[PDB]
Amino acid sequence: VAYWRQAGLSYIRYSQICAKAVRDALKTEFKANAEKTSGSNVKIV
Amino acid sequence: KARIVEYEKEMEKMKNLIPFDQMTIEDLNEAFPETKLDKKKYPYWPHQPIENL
Amino acid sequence: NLFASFIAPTILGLPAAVLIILFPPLLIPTSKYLINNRLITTQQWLIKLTSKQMMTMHNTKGRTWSLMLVSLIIFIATTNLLGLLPHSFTPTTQLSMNLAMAIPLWAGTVIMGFRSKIKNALAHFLPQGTPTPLIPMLVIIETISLLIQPMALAVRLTANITAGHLLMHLIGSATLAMSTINLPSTLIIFTILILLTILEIAVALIQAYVFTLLVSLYLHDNT
Amino acid sequence: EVKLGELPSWILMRDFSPSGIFGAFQRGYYRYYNKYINVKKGSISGITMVLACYVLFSYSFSYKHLKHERLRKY
Amino acid sequence: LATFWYYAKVELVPPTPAEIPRAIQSLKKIVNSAQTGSFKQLTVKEAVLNGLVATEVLMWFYVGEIIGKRGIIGYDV
Amino acid sequence: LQSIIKNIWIPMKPYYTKVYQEIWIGMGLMGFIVYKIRAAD
Amino acid sequence: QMSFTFASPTQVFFNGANVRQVDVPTLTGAFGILAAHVPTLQVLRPGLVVVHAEDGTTSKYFVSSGSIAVNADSSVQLLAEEAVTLDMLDLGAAKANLEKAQAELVGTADEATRAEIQIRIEANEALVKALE
Amino acid sequence: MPQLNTTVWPTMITPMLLTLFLITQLKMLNTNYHLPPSPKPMKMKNYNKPW
Amino acid sequence: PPLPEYGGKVRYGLIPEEFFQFLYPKTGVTGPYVLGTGLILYALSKEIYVISAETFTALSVLGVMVYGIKKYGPFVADFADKLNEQKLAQLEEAKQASIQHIQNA
Amino acid sequence: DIDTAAKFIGAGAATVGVAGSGAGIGTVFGSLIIGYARNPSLKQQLFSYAILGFALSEAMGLFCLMVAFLILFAM
């Protein structure tokens, strides 16, 4: 029982945050391309 | 051109070098002032951060 | 009788233990050259590795003691190994020498830990999250432990080398007393002696390194 | 040096003073270290010989205790 | 393995009855240098060489001693 | 007195005056302890 | 014996390969996986992943999250959400993000966003330490 | 137990204090590790083209 | 000043070839061996070399040292040589490394 | 004397109590090995606790030896 699960999160959120952290710490050479390949366009209705 | 002849003299000095297997750490430090240890920031052995040791 | 190897050796009425204590550093030649022979090469490599493995954890104030600690871990080590030579007198087997190595070192370390940082120094006697009803004894226990640690160091080294050499000598005597009886048993005891000798080499190195590491961690605590 | 001289005055010719013996010892140390240790492609012998001499010197002072455990009596 | 005997057949040999004269001549040369005191011309290196081969023959005497008592370490009795 | 203080006392001074002061105090304490021990014997 | 399958949503690093040992930073600790390993399944936390090939060379990737699964047939499937080779990163950006997240932490007060911040901090700490 | 013979303690303490704090520390101080050679192939103070 | 390329030709790690060649003229080649076996028989016979536990500990430690040498001698020797040549090659990389720099300037 | 005899007996007895410290350090360093094998990134920090753990185990051991000497010499 990790701390964030005690806070009410979900591993999907954990994974999003971690992937975003690795994408931001990416060099500007690869940063735009990597961010493109993981951008979210879906919209809830 | 003054600067050029100066660079020339410097490179020439670097050209005439002692074969390394006879060179003392003092001669090395002379031929490359970078290799000299900072006796000021680290006045105690080994005068350099242990990390890069 | 049995402790003949630990009596302060004298030759021609002269206290030759001093020469034995002075000798180890004679096995570490230095050189101002850049490329040198094999011995100094490997020894500089070993000193480099030891310095890296020991001092790294310390802050900028601790690493000033670097020259001390490394020297320590060399001295002891060499002495220990020189002990394993036949008929050699091992000066680490003497409680006097280890006391004089420990009490000054640990002493000065606690001294400098008290001079500055006196607040947290007296606060290290109390762990962080301690409830109230058990405060007093938690102080006195730390007091005893701290005020005795040098004794622990000195004895842990002294008697360890003592027991090592004494047991090697006893199994040697046993092999002697089995020379005129079953030869296969003589060979078995001899092999046990060989294994014990290897273990004694290892214990020499390890005891040196552990004495060093303990003093180093005390320094780290008081810095 | 010796191995060349055959006169006893040489004995009194040397320097029997503290600095003299210090220098003679340093000279011997350097001669040894330069013939057996301070050479590339060196061996282990340059230190095994010293350990041998050390064992000998130890057995020396240990003889006073060891002479009591002689096997025979004559 | 066998070259030990190969060198023995040269240097480890019961000396022949035909060579003792050369030995007694060496002996008289030695005793003559002793009488005249000419050994002082002998530099210390060869003098040491002689003393060491002398200790060599002395060891031959002691090994003869231990083989003559049939005991290797001290006297059995 | 020459080449002694030059090759011994020269390098060690920064250690012998600032790094090792508490070491000297501990040396004094150890010496006093040893003297007390040798006394009661 | 080990059939490895290291994959990312957009890239296949290994596939059915034969390595000797893979080290993974599972959310419940790091552990190694060699052939015939006990069958398990785990989720990852940001960390290095060193894959040891039979020859002895080691490929050191970095994964931010995902799932490791080793099965009865010594068939390992490691899926990683963002699997970057260590060269595509830098220490300065990581350290700066770490500072920003620590600052937001000491500023924030609500458990949900506090946990979010702490997760970001964990990712960045793992980053800085894993790089160098 | 010979270790308890308080008669011969100083003859053990003194030479250790000499060899651990003076000799060995010196033989260390002679062992220095120069910084690695770093030939800088980028160092050129060229003023702006004169202009 | 450079270093000589070799040591002193010690035999068995205990005796140098100097002594052997020095004894060579008088008593030939086995002279030294016979001297050694003599002296050892004397020392162990006249109780100069007492035999006790120390002798068996000595045998053990000598056996360990000799096996350790014969096993891990080449490794440490070549490792020292590798360290030296690595240092030398790096230093050569530096030599003519600053040259190209100033050349461009 | 019977007093000296009982001093020796009680000394050996009070010495027995060091087995507890022996097993205690054994457990502490074993747990340190496991905990490091699990979360090696915390090695440094973990090591700290280990020392502290050790520092209290030996603590109790000391008391035993204390009585030992405090019977062997002080009494």
Short mmCIF file of N, CA, C and O in Angstrom, two decimals, chain C residues 142-189:
data_model
loop_
_atom_site.label_atom_id
_atom_site.label_comp_id
_atom_site.label_asym_id
_atom_site.label_seq_id
_atom_site.Cartn_x
_atom_site.Cartn_y
_atom_site.Cartn_z
N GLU C 142 23.55 5.38 25.94
CA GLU C 142 24.41 5.99 24.94
C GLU C 142 25.70 6.49 25.56
O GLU C 142 26.77 6.39 24.96
N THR C 143 25.61 7.04 26.77
CA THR C 143 26.82 7.50 27.45
C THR C 143 27.80 6.36 27.62
O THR C 143 28.98 6.48 27.29
N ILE C 144 27.32 5.23 28.14
CA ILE C 144 28.22 4.10 28.37
C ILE C 144 28.83 3.63 27.06
O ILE C 144 30.05 3.43 26.94
N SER C 145 27.99 3.45 26.04
CA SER C 145 28.48 2.94 24.77
C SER C 145 29.55 3.86 24.20
O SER C 145 30.63 3.40 23.80
N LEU C 146 29.26 5.15 24.14
CA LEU C 146 30.22 6.10 23.60
C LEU C 146 31.50 6.09 24.41
O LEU C 146 32.60 5.96 23.86
N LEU C 147 31.38 6.21 25.73
CA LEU C 147 32.54 6.30 26.59
C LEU C 147 33.35 5.02 26.64
O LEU C 147 34.44 5.03 27.20
N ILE C 148 32.85 3.92 26.08
CA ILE C 148 33.64 2.69 26.06
C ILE C 148 34.15 2.32 24.67
O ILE C 148 35.13 1.56 24.58
N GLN C 149 33.52 2.80 23.60
CA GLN C 149 33.89 2.39 22.24
C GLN C 149 35.39 2.21 21.99
O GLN C 149 35.75 1.21 21.35
N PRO C 150 36.28 3.10 22.43
CA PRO C 150 37.71 2.85 22.17
C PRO C 150 38.20 1.55 22.76
O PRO C 150 39.04 0.87 22.15
N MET C 151 37.71 1.18 23.95
CA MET C 151 38.06 -0.11 24.51
C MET C 151 37.63 -1.23 23.58
O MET C 151 38.38 -2.19 23.36
N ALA C 152 36.43 -1.12 23.01
CA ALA C 152 35.96 -2.13 22.07
C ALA C 152 36.91 -2.25 20.90
O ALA C 152 37.32 -3.36 20.53
N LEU C 153 37.27 -1.13 20.28
CA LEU C 153 38.20 -1.17 19.16
C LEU C 153 39.48 -1.88 19.54
O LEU C 153 39.90 -2.86 18.90
N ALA C 154 40.14 -1.37 20.58
CA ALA C 154 41.45 -1.88 20.95
C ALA C 154 41.40 -3.37 21.21
O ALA C 154 42.23 -4.13 20.69
N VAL C 155 40.42 -3.83 21.98
CA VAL C 155 40.39 -5.25 22.33
C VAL C 155 40.01 -6.10 21.13
O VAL C 155 40.61 -7.15 20.89
N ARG C 156 39.00 -5.67 20.37
CA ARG C 156 38.58 -6.42 19.20
C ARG C 156 39.72 -6.67 18.26
O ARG C 156 39.80 -7.73 17.63
N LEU C 157 40.64 -5.72 18.13
CA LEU C 157 41.79 -6.00 17.30
C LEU C 157 42.81 -6.86 18.03
O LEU C 157 43.29 -7.87 17.49
N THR C 158 43.12 -6.49 19.27
CA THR C 158 44.19 -7.14 20.02
C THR C 158 43.96 -8.63 20.16
O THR C 158 44.73 -9.45 19.65
N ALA C 159 42.88 -9.00 20.85
CA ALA C 159 42.60 -10.41 21.09
C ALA C 159 42.30 -11.17 19.82
O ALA C 159 42.43 -12.39 19.80
N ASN C 160 41.89 -10.49 18.76
CA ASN C 160 41.59 -11.23 17.54
C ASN C 160 42.87 -11.72 16.93
O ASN C 160 43.01 -12.91 16.61
N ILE C 161 43.83 -10.82 16.77
CA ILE C 161 45.11 -11.28 16.28
C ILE C 161 45.71 -12.28 17.25
O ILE C 161 46.34 -13.26 16.83
N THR C 162 45.53 -12.06 18.55
CA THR C 162 46.07 -12.97 19.54
C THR C 162 45.54 -14.38 19.33
O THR C 162 46.31 -15.33 19.20
N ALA C 163 44.22 -14.52 19.30
CA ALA C 163 43.62 -15.84 19.15
C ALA C 163 44.00 -16.46 17.82
O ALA C 163 44.25 -17.67 17.74
N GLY C 164 44.06 -15.66 16.76
CA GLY C 164 44.47 -16.21 15.49
C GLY C 164 45.83 -16.87 15.59
O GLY C 164 45.98 -18.06 15.28
N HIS C 165 46.82 -16.12 16.04
CA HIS C 165 48.17 -16.67 16.08
C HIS C 165 48.26 -17.82 17.06
O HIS C 165 48.94 -18.82 16.80
N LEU C 166 47.57 -17.72 18.18
CA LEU C 166 47.64 -18.75 19.20
C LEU C 166 47.06 -20.06 18.68
O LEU C 166 47.63 -21.13 18.92
N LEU C 167 45.96 -19.99 17.95
CA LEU C 167 45.37 -21.21 17.43
C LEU C 167 46.21 -21.81 16.32
O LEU C 167 46.37 -23.03 16.24
N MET C 168 46.74 -20.98 15.42
CA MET C 168 47.65 -21.52 14.42
C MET C 168 48.80 -22.24 15.10
O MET C 168 49.17 -23.35 14.69
N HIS C 169 49.34 -21.66 16.16
CA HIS C 169 50.44 -22.30 16.86
C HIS C 169 50.01 -23.61 17.50
O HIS C 169 50.76 -24.58 17.50
N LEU C 170 48.80 -23.65 18.06
CA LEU C 170 48.38 -24.88 18.71
C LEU C 170 48.17 -26.00 17.70
O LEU C 170 48.58 -27.14 17.94
N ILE C 171 47.55 -25.69 16.56
CA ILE C 171 47.38 -26.74 15.57
C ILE C 171 48.73 -27.17 15.02
O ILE C 171 48.93 -28.35 14.70
N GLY C 172 49.68 -26.25 14.93
CA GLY C 172 51.02 -26.65 14.56
C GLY C 172 51.60 -27.64 15.56
O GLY C 172 52.17 -28.66 15.18
N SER C 173 51.43 -27.35 16.85
CA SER C 173 51.92 -28.27 17.86
C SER C 173 51.24 -29.62 17.74
O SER C 173 51.87 -30.66 17.93
N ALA C 174 49.96 -29.61 17.40
CA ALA C 174 49.24 -30.86 17.23
C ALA C 174 49.84 -31.67 16.09
O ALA C 174 50.15 -32.85 16.24
N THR C 175 50.02 -31.03 14.93
CA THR C 175 50.68 -31.71 13.82
C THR C 175 52.02 -32.27 14.26
O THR C 175 52.40 -33.38 13.87
N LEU C 176 52.74 -31.53 15.09
CA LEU C 176 53.99 -32.05 15.62
C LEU C 176 53.76 -33.33 16.41
O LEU C 176 54.45 -34.34 16.21
N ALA C 177 52.76 -33.32 17.29
CA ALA C 177 52.48 -34.49 18.11
C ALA C 177 51.80 -35.60 17.33
O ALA C 177 51.59 -36.68 17.88
N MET C 178 51.44 -35.37 16.07
CA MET C 178 50.89 -36.41 15.21
C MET C 178 51.89 -36.84 14.15
O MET C 178 51.54 -37.61 13.25
N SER C 179 53.12 -36.36 14.23
CA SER C 179 54.13 -36.75 13.25
C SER C 179 54.52 -38.21 13.41
O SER C 179 54.77 -38.90 12.42
N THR C 180 54.59 -38.69 14.64
CA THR C 180 55.00 -40.06 14.92
C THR C 180 53.83 -41.03 15.01
O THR C 180 54.02 -42.19 15.38
N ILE C 181 52.63 -40.57 14.68
CA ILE C 181 51.43 -41.40 14.68
C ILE C 181 50.81 -41.22 13.31
O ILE C 181 51.43 -40.61 12.43
N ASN C 182 49.60 -41.74 13.11
CA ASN C 182 48.99 -41.94 11.79
C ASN C 182 49.33 -40.82 10.82
O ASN C 182 49.01 -39.66 11.07
N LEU C 183 49.95 -41.18 9.72
CA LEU C 183 50.38 -40.21 8.73
C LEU C 183 49.18 -39.57 8.04
O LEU C 183 49.20 -38.36 7.79
N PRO C 184 48.13 -40.32 7.68
CA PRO C 184 46.94 -39.65 7.12
C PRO C 184 46.32 -38.64 8.07
O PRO C 184 45.86 -37.58 7.63
N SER C 185 46.29 -38.94 9.37
CA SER C 185 45.82 -37.94 10.32
C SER C 185 46.74 -36.73 10.34
O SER C 185 46.28 -35.59 10.46
N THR C 186 48.04 -36.99 10.20
CA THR C 186 49.02 -35.87 10.15
C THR C 186 48.69 -34.99 8.94
O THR C 186 48.76 -33.76 9.07
N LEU C 187 48.34 -35.61 7.80
CA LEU C 187 48.02 -34.85 6.61
C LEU C 187 46.72 -34.09 6.78
O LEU C 187 46.58 -32.95 6.31
N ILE C 188 45.74 -34.69 7.46
CA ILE C 188 44.47 -34.00 7.67
C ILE C 188 44.67 -32.77 8.55
O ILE C 188 44.17 -31.68 8.24
N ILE C 189 45.40 -32.93 9.65
CA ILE C 189 45.64 -31.78 10.51
C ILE C 189 46.46 -30.73 9.77
O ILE C 189 46.23 -29.53 9.93
#
